[PDB]
Amino acid sequence: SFPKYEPSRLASLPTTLDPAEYDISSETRKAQAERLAIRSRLKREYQLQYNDPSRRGVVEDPALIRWTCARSANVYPNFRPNTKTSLLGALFGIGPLIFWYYVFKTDRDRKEKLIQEGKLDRTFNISY
Amino acid sequence: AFLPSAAYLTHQQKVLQLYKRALRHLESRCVHRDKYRYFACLLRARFDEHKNEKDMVKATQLLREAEKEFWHGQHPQPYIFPESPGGTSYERYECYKVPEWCLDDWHPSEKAMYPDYFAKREQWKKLRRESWEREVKQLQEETPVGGPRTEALPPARKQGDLPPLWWHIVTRPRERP
Amino acid sequence: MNLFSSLTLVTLILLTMPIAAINFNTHKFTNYPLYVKTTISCAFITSMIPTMMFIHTGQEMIISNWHWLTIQTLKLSLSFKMDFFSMMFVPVALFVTWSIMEFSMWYMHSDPNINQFFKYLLLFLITMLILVTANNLFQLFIGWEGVGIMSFLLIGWWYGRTDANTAALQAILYNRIGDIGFILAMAWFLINLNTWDLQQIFMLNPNDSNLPLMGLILAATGKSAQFGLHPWLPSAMEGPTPVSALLHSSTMVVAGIFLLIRFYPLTENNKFGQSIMLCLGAMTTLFTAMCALTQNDIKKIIAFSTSSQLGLMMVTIGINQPHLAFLHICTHAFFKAMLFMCSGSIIHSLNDEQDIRKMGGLFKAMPFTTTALIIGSLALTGMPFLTGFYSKDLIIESANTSYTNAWALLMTLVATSFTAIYSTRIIFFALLGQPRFPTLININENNPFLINSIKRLLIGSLFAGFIISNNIPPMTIPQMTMPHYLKMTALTVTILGFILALEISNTTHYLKFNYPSNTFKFSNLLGYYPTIMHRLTPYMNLTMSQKSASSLLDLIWL
Amino acid sequence: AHIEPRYRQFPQLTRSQVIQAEFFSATMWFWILWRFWHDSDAVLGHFPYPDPSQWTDEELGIPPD
Amino acid sequence: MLKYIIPTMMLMPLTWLSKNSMIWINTTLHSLLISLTSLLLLNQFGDNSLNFSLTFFSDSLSTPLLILTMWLLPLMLMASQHHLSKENLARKKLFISMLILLQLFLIMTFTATELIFFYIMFEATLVPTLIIITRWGNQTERLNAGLYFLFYTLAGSLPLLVALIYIQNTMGSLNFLILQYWVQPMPNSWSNTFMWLACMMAFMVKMPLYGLHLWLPKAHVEAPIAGSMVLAAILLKLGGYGMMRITLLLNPITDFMAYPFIMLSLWGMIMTSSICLRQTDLKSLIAYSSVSHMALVIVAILIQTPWSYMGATALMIAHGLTSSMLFCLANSNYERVHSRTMILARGLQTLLPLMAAWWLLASLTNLALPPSINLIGELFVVMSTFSWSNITIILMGLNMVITALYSLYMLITTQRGKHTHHINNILPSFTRENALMSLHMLPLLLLSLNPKIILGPLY
Amino acid sequence: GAHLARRYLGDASVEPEPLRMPTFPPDYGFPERKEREMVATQQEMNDAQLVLQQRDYCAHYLIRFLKCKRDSFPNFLACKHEQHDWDYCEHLDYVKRMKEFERERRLLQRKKRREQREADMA
Amino acid sequence: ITKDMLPGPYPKTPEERAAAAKKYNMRVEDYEPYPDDGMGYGDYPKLPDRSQQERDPWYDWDHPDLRLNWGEPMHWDLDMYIRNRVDTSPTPVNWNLMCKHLFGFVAFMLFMFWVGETYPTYQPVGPKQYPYNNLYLERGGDPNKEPEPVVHYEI
Numbered sequence A: 001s002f003p004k005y006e007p008s009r010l011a012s013l014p015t016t017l018d019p020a021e022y023d024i025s026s027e028t029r030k031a032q033a034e035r036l037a038i039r040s041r042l043k044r045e046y047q048l049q050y051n052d053p054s055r056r057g058v059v060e061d062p063a064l065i066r067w068t069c070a071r072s073a074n075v076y077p078n079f080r081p082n083t084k085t086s087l088l089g090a091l092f093g094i095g096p097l098i099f100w101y102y103v104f105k106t107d108r109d110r111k112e113k114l115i116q117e118g119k120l121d122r123t124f125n126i127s128y
Numbered sequence B: 001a002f003l004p005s006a007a008y009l010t011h012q013q014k015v016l017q018l019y020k021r022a023l024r025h026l027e028s029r030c031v032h033r034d035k036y037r038y039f040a041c042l043l044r045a046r047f048d049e050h051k052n053e054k055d056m057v058k059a060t061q062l063l064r065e066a067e068k069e070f071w072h073g074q075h076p077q078p079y080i081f082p083e084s085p086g087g088t089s090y091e092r093y094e095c096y097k098v099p100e101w102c103l104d105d106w107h108p109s110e111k112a113m114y115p116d117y118f119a120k121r122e123q124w125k126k127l128r129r130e131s132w133e134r135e136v137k138q139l140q141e142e143t144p145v146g147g148p149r150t151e152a153l154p155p156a157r158k159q160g161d162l163p164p165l166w167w168h169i170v171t172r173p174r175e176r177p
Numbered sequence C: 001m002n003l004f005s006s007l008t009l010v011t012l013i014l015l016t017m018p019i020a021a022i023n024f025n026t027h028k029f030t031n032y033p034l035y036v037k038t039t040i041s042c043a044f045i046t047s048m049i050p051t052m053m054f055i056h057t058g059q060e061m062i063i064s065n066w067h068w069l070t071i072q073t074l075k076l077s078l079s080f081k082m083d084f085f086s087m088m089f090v091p092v093a094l095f096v097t098w099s100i101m102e103f104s105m106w107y108m109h110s111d112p113n114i115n116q117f118f119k120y121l122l123l124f125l126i127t128m129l130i131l132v133t134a135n136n137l138f139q140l141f142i143g144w145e146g147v148g149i150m151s152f153l154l155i156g157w158w159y160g161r162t163d164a165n166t167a168a169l170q171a172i173l174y175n176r177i178g179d180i181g182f183i184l185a186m187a188w189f190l191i192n193l194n195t196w197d198l199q200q201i202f203m204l205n206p207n208d209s210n211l212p213l214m215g216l217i218l219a220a221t222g223k224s225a226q227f228g229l230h231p232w233l234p235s236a237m238e239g240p241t242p243v244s245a246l247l248h249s250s251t252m253v254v255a256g257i258f259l260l261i262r263f264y265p266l267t268e269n270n271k272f273g274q275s276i277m278l279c280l281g282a283m284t285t286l287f288t289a290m291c292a293l294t295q296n297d298i299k300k301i302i303a304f305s306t307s308s309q310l311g312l313m314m315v316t317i318g319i320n321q322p323h324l325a326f327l328h329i330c331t332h333a334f335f336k337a338m339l340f341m342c343s344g345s346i347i348h349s350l351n352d353e354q355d356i357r358k359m360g361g362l363f364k365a366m367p368f369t370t371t372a373l374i375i376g377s378l379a380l381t382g383m384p385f386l387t388g389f390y391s392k393d394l395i396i397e398s399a400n401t402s403y404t405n406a407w408a409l410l411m412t413l414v415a416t417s418f419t420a421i422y423s424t425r426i427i428f429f430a431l432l433g434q435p436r437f438p439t440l441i442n443i444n445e446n447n448p449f450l451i452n453s454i455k456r457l458l459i460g461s462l463f464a465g466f467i468i469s470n471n472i473p474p475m476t477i478p479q480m481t482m483p484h485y486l487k488m489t490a491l492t493v494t495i496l497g498f499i500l501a502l503e504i505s506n507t508t509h510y511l512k513f514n515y516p517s518n519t520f521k522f523s524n525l526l527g528y529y530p531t532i533m534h535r536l537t538p539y540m541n542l543t544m545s546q547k548s549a550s551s552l553l554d555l556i557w558l
Numbered sequence D: 001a002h003i004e005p006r007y008r009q010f011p012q013l014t015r016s017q018v019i020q021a022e023f024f025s026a027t028m029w030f031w032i033l034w035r036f037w038h039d040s041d042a043v044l045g046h047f048p049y050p051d052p053s054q055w056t057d058e059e060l061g062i063p064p065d
Numbered sequence E: 001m002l003k004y005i006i007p008t009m010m011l012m013p014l015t016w017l018s019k020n021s022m023i024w025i026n027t028t029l030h031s032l033l034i035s036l037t038s039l040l041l042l043n044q045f046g047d048n049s050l051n052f053s054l055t056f057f058s059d060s061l062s063t064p065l066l067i068l069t070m071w072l073l074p075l076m077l078m079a080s081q082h083h084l085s086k087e088n089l090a091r092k093k094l095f096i097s098m099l100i101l102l103q104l105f106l107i108m109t110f111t112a113t114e115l116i117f118f119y120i121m122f123e124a125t126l127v128p129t130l131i132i133i134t135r136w137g138n139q140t141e142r143l144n145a146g147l148y149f150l151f152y153t154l155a156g157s158l159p160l161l162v163a164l165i166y167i168q169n170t171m172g173s174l175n176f177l178i179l180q181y182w183v184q185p186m187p188n189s190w191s192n193t194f195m196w197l198a199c200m201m202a203f204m205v206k207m208p209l210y211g212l213h214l215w216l217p218k219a220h221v222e223a224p225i226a227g228s229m230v231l232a233a234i235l236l237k238l239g240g241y242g243m244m245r246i247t248l249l250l251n252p253i254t255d256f257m258a259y260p261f262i263m264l265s266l267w268g269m270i271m272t273s274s275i276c277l278r279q280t281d282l283k284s285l286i287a288y289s290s291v292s293h294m295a296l297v298i299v300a301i302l303i304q305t306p307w308s309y310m311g312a313t314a315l316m317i318a319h320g321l322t323s324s325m326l327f328c329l330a331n332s333n334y335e336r337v338h339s340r341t342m343i344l345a346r347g348l349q350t351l352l353p354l355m356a357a358w359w360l361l362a363s364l365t366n367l368a369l370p371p372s373i374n375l376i377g378e379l380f381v382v383m384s385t386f387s388w389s390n391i392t393i394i395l396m397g398l399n400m401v402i403t404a405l406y407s408l409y410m411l412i413t414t415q416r417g418k419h420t421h422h423i424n425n426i427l428p429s430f431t432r433e434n435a436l437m438s439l440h441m442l443p444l445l446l447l448s449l450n451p452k453i454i455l456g457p458l459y
Numbered sequence F: 001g002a003h004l005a006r007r008y009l010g011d012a013s014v015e016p017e018p019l020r021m022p023t024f025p026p027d028y029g030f031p032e033r034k035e036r037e038m039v040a041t042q043q044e045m046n047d048a049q050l051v052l053q054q055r056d057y058c059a060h061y062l063i064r065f066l067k068c069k070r071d072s073f074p075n076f077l078a079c080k081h082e083q084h085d086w087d088y089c090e091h092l093d094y095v096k097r098m099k100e101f102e103r104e105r106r107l108l109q110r111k112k113r114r115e116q117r118e119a120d121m122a
Numbered sequence G: 001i002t003k004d005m006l007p008g009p010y011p012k013t014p015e016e017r018a019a020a021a022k023k024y025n026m027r028v029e030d031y032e033p034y035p036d037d038g039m040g041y042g043d044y045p046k047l048p049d050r051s052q053q054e055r056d057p058w059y060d061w062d063h064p065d066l067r068l069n070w071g072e073p074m075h076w077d078l079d080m081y082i083r084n085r086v087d088t089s090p091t092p093v094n095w096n097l098m099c100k101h102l103f104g105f106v107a108f109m110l111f112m113f114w115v116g117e118t119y120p121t122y123q124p125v126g127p128k129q130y131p132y133n134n135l136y137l138e139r140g141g142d143p144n145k146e147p148e149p150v151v152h153y154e155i
């Protein structure tokens, strides 16, 4: 019939073409009502501090503080050296260093061999 | 799906929103006005063919392949209104929307440039601060246990009181400063 | 002699004087935009005298007036090159900018940051005439990065809007990718030729100049929105209308083309650079003109128009005809600035409406705007003996009659037809037919600022090709002998484009609804190129910028 | 007095903008017809393009052997 | 140099005998007078360095770092006086005394005629900086950085000490003037390989090197503003100064010992710049930018051409000014919103237009807008590394894209977009803060007029 | 443009290649062929600062036209006939290039029919 | 802020998972962490990688530009999925179909320029002829040496 839309990593499926959006069951009513309840409670807890006149400053958001503490602090104490961590720290850790090492060493050996054989046009090359 | 009051979309709301998005994407497909108006009555007939469908599972399936029809026939760049999100003039003046509390940080030599304005702003702030504790003690006795269920707020009940959580909605910046 | 160099420097110092005025302010201004417009009018009048006494004798010179630095063999001096390119570009740029600012005194009147806007626009003009007059690569890099940064600041003018900041950072990204190649060219000339000065580059005249010309072609790709580094020029329509009119149609975006025209003695002795310029220009002038066929925002359509004209400029450099390319720059400035001004006059009249599907019926509502939009479109397409005829047709008259990549010529002709297609598409959806805009008509254009600002570029778009092409000396030999099917090529292809697009436009009144074709989905989503690479190349950067770079190596292992 | 905004109908026009628009449209077609009447070769052709086959073997030096 | 050391020491009785409301004004005044005095060091010659005594000398490498050092003290006194207002008066004088003592150590670190006096003053600069960072850093969480400072002491300064004592026994002197004329070629041997690592790794960590930069987005974060200013502006540049002195003795083994570390920097500036695109912490973003700019100075010293030394010392002066101004802008928002999170306070051009102008100018100097000396240093290093290898321009130019990308992102996030609603303590800009931004930026802009005084001894 | 189809779709053996031609001697078929006279002196076009692409066998018309263009300032429409003279003689130079091309094509036809006559006869 | 609202190690027991989902302010059923391979994410919730461009724009947001609320557990790459950056939004044409059309178009245009460079078009003319030994002294020839005679003839 029709071409079915293919989702991707950078092209998500729409809300309309997802089947689980069309759930009518009461457990989905419970989950949606609890999400609405948590969101309404957090909205109320925010805008009681936001609309307060006696507060003049920053309504601190512990989800934001928790996000920054996860992006900075929680990186080392939850590390475990295993096969996956060591192989991925050896691929992107000492891989491209070795790559550019052999590339630049090859080109510099080529250029040195051409200079000591009188081949490289180093005529007007007096700034270096 | 994601709404402030309801936790979902009713089937009636889904039908109306799909009808509206179909007409908007159709008007994007069908630039001229008489031509779009002809196809708009044709599409209204197509939507009113199964308006009287009692079976909600069959109406669910019909709505699902109607979404597939709408996705197969959508315009790639539909007409977005300029101040609608995705428009060319959307959120353009947000760099001019200074919050009101910055008037509190003015120097008194320029506060004296507009005497009536700040002399009235003092009693606006007075109104806000003698309304605040009354609307807090209004919200604390009406909210159920576990917090409020829905994001909607109750209105001002007594005479003389103000509706709760009102200052940033009333004193919001104009859309064209 | 003492008149030429003096008024040459007086033009640039006069352009810098309102910057000192706006920086040394205490009062609120007695119409500072009028002051900057008066200053740029007088700077135009000042620069007219060296141009006239260049047309009299051919008088070129260099003003290496201030010694700045000496790195052991490299004497970097403040050096201004007054040649044919500066003498034809400076009056055209000042005339266009003067019309853009008299336009902006009407269009940008509601903006409370109008003095900052005119300040930034003057800063752009100063950096651009630093670019086009520079005699070494370093001062040219100063003007180059200056027009890049003022492009950033004038795209992101409504800095609260997310899309404007996104488009400005996008333009900076693609321009710095071009700057990779510009710095490659500077590095090659400093190492192999011991100079950044143009004179020693041209006098030494190297033969193994493939690598610096590849660097310059990458620089012109980043700057003139060639294929691969193009989409920032359609993205850059998120800025205001006089920004897109002055900078991103006529003045800034020709600077990669100007960089390649500036280095013509290296390109005329390197056939490989000519072939790469020809292929890249034909690819860009095909692709952007094809994308322009199926768009609905009028600023996007005229930006694809100016990028297709830049691709055609790259084509006519690539056939070793640089002076025709620069005549096409000086020609293109007038009618493309006028087309953006008339489109923005429609936009401001129709209450910030830019989508052509809600326009129409403006032939008798906005008569002067309709007149000038038709004249600008006909100068764009190559109507006989408008200004766009005196260069672009000659481009085809040298693109046919030369040792040329054949497919590049065929795509050049397809682009020539597509220009007529989107021009009559603009005239169809925006001027013809019956109205589609909303019901509260506030249509008005009766301001002497708007009318005179479109009027002077209208006089330019009518007479300037004739005047300039009869005032410039020969620098090549014009190939004037060809068969009649080859002489009548560009006109016939343009009229075939008009006929095909009129048939397309008259298929829209029919009461039929067709499913979208794959060509329509390809050209409407911009060859799928800003949809993929703007998602994929950031993703593969930023996860790699977080998972392995920050978290894995530089917080745990190392 | 300015142009009043109108509703669902044709907006007010000035005599001056209409006569200027007609004047520049007449200027466009005047200049097009003028330079087409005087040049007539930048669009059509400057010089005759000769036929190569219509050239004789003596002026080109083709001895038949 | 004794006309500079003695006024810097007289700033100690000036700061301890001053009246309690006058101790910022007096130290700022007399340190600005010392910074005006600091221009007498511009008596340089095209052949000879300016050689004062047996203990102190100044070529055109040490002179601009001295002027920047003596200029940095009044700016640190301006920057650090707001958040010390509720401090005890004696603790405030202790802070000012540690700043003065750090300047005192630095201005005879850069002029050290002999290399072990350079080592003593070089490792003497760490102690007042340590005390400033850990007594006024507003939070101290250094569980991983203790082991890294142990790694700095093991792999760094102690092999440098043993190597300098070895040169003292071999050459008979560590006078740099004598070592200009008594230098022997350091040939290929394993003894000379460990000699090269001992002479270089202390300064490699001080730059910092990529992979060894683990301390710098911690020590910049956990510090007060004066500590971050002196770390970004001067204390990284001790490594580059020491490399440019000690690579006299390391020829010709440097011509094949530079190849690993050059890779560590040429790829490293690709990574850390990219790291700046994913920073939640603004101060950490400026720290990784400092790593991404000192990688070029490491490469330019290791390739040891004239254009590379000129570009490296111009980049050192320019990056000192620029990154010090960036940390001061980060503090001028942190003193209002009380958090370093870069996504917290947005849209600040709607609220602070002149401060957003300072953000724009510091970003344009950060991304090397010509003709600024950031671009002059960047550009000369790029030219010299093109002469080293013609492929490296890719790794240069790609860096010069990403260096633009996080520079404007830092501008776009903090200053542009929509303002944050729940933050209402955003005060207008104090005249102190704008004066601090101008005393950073206006010298940096005036040095574009006359860059020849910051291009080192072989201009 | 038909010769492009003759060289690509047909054979390139009989079509003269653009890069290296004439492949035949200039006296081959021409009894006592004369040279091409240059009218403007080398020093005269040296002082006129002409482009190296413009110093062909008819640059003297260009020198007369540029002297007229200098001397008729500001009346920039007063020297149309000198431009016409230069364009007409450049046209004649292009005609001479066409004559060289047709000469080379007809001598390659002579060689083709010669070897076909030799294959038919011997 | 205090410790029991800060992130911790990987949740192993279900009651630690419940304590974290109460800490991260979301449902326990939606709360999934990143898998404990040792990559240092900790107990942070694996949000389903939706760009903030995809959100409801007309919804009353706490952070309107971010399209984000107060107290909502943010995405791990929230700095990456802002509307100034990486988007994951649905497109009218499929992702692989876009990649196929782009690669076929770009590679086919490259191949057609290679075909046209293989077969160049030209004019039915001879080479351009210049006097004075192919302009020998003009093109940088030395005045002491004398080249071969470059003589052109009338036709």
Ligand SMILES: CCCCCCCCCCCCCCCCCC(=O)OC[C@H](COP(=O)([O-])OC[C@H](O)COP(=O)([O-])OC[C@H](COC(=O)CCCCCCCCCCCCCCCCC)OC(=O)CCCCCCCCCCCCCCCCC)OC(=O)CCCCCCCCCCCCCCCCC
Pocket: C022, C023, C024, C116, C123, C127, C130, C139, C142, C143, C146, C149, C150, E353, E354, E356, E357, E358, E360, E361, E364, E365, E369, E370, E371, E372, E442, E445, E446, E448, E449
């Ligand atoms: C030794 C004597 C020398 C004398 C000559 C001076 C030499 C240079 C000195 C410093 C120049 C900059 C000074 C102003 C900037 C800083 C303050 C500021 O922001 O003020 C805004 C304010 C105006 O704005 P506002 O509306 O009032 O309020 C701010 C707004 O709210 C919000 O602001 P905004 O967004 O509306 O507008 C900000 C706008 C934003 O505009 C931009 O960001 C655009 C800039 C980049 C693109 C354009 C330039 C590209 C490069 C080409 C030009 C340079 C080379 C030219 C040479 C020929 C070609 C090679 O910036 C400007 O307009 C600044 C103009 C000058 C910019 C210089 C380049 C900065 C870019 C980064 C570095 C680039 C390379 C280094 C350049 C070095 C030049 C020497 O200016 C003032 O009030 C002026 C204050 C006094 C200034 C004194 C300057 C001299 C100081 C030195 C003292 C010692 C020597 C004695 C000389 C005394 C002379 C009077």
Ligand SMILES: CCCCCCCCCCCCCCCCCC(=O)OC[C@H](COP(=O)([O-])OCC[N+](C)(C)C)OC(=O)CCCCCCCCCCCCCCCCC
Pocket: C065, C066, C067, C068, C069, C076, C077, C078, C079, C136, C138, C139, E371, E448, E449
């Ligand atoms: C209203 C303002 C105008 C001033 C009004 C009041 C004064 C009246 C007018 C008369 C002025 C005085 C007489 C003329 C001036 C003095 C002339 C003179 O010899 O001066 C000495 C010199 C001339 O140079 P020099 O060659 O003699 O010496 C150079 C110095 N050494 C040798 C050590 C390197 O300086 C000047 O003239 C300074 C003015 C320069 C003007 C341009 C400045 C541009 C700054 C840009 C910075 C970045 C550059 C990057 C680009 C570099 C190139 C790529």
Ligand SMILES: CCCCCCCCCCCCCCCCCC(=O)OC[C@H](COP(=O)(O)OCCN)OC(=O)CCCCCCCCCCCCCCCCC
Pocket: C163, C166, C167, C170, C173, C174, C177, C180, C217, C218, C221, C227, C228, C229, C235, C280, C530, C533, C534, C535, C537, C538, C541, C542, E277, E394, E397, E398, E401, E405, G083, G084, G085, G086, G087
């Ligand atoms: C003549 C020779 C021609 C040679 C051609 C081949 C070489 C060049 C190849 C193409 C390189 C450029 C294209 C890929 C990167 C493009 C990134 C970009 O522009 O992102 C834009 C994107 C927003 O775009 P858009 O989706 O339109 O936004 C509006 C609505 N959201 O904005 C964002 O998403 C923000 C992202 C910020 C962080 C960017 C991370 C990626 C950085 C890419 C650096 C590329 C460096 C290349 C170096 C090459 C060296 C040789």
Ligand SMILES: *C(=O)CCCCCCCCCCCCC
Pocket: C400, C485, C486, C489, C492, F001, F002, F003, F004, G121, G122
């Ligand atoms: C042989 O055909 C010589 C002409 C140049 C090459 C072919 C160009 C074909 C396209 C141009 C003419 C189009 C006429 C509608």
